[PDB]
A paper describes a structure:
The Mex67–Mtr2 complex (NXF1–NXT1 in metazoans and small bristles in Drosophila melanogastor) is the principal mRNA-export factor in Sacccharomyces cerevisiae. Mex67/NXF1 is a modular protein constructed from four domains: an RNA-recognition motif (RRM) domain, a leucine-rich repeat (LRR) domain, a nuclear transport factor 2-like (NTF2L) domain and an ubiquitin-associated (UBA) domain. Mtr2 is a ∼15–20 kDa protein that also has an NTF2-like fold and forms a tight heterodimeric complex with the Mex67 NTF2L domain.
Classically, binding of the RNA cargo has been attributed to the RRM and LRR domains because together these domains are sufficient for Homo sapiens NXF1 to bind the viral RNA CTE (constitutive transport element) sequence motif. d for the ctMex67LRR-NTF2L–Mtr2 (RRM domain deletion) was 6.8 µM, whereas that for ctMex67RRM-LRR (NTF2L–Mtr2 region deletion) was 5.5 µM. These data indicated that as in S. cerevisiae the RRM, LRR and NTF2L–Mtr2 regions all contribute to RNA binding by ctMex67–Mtr2.
Numbering used by the authors: 196 to 223, 237 to 359
The structure:
Amino acid sequence: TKQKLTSCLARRYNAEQKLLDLSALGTDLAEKSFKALMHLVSNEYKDPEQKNEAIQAVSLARNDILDVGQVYSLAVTLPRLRRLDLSGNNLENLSKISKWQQEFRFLEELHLTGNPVTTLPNYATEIKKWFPSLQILDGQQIRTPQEAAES
């Protein structure tokens, strides 16, 4: 199991992009199954600094995620995450993201394309407010680099 999960994580890690691709896990999801992955990624690195530098980006795209509570511990495991892809899930409104208020303080790029929350009137305004380092939301620049240097 640990061997199988470790092998899966290795196959899904792109060193060149510093990216851990956890998209579409159901095709090879559950909070306790996700917690297990997070425990394994935490155990990989003896130095948190190396972990922080190795995994700068994560995709959780296409996982039928209804609430970020489902994958909450990503915020604990990778507090210095810079890029996050949550595209192609089913996050319906801002309350489905609010469990990550005050987390991902260093996140610079966020993708929510394909989630219903993106079409609500206060979407971009609130997401900008909640994540102070965010420069790109769905490919749209929402903070200039100088703006972000001050946020």
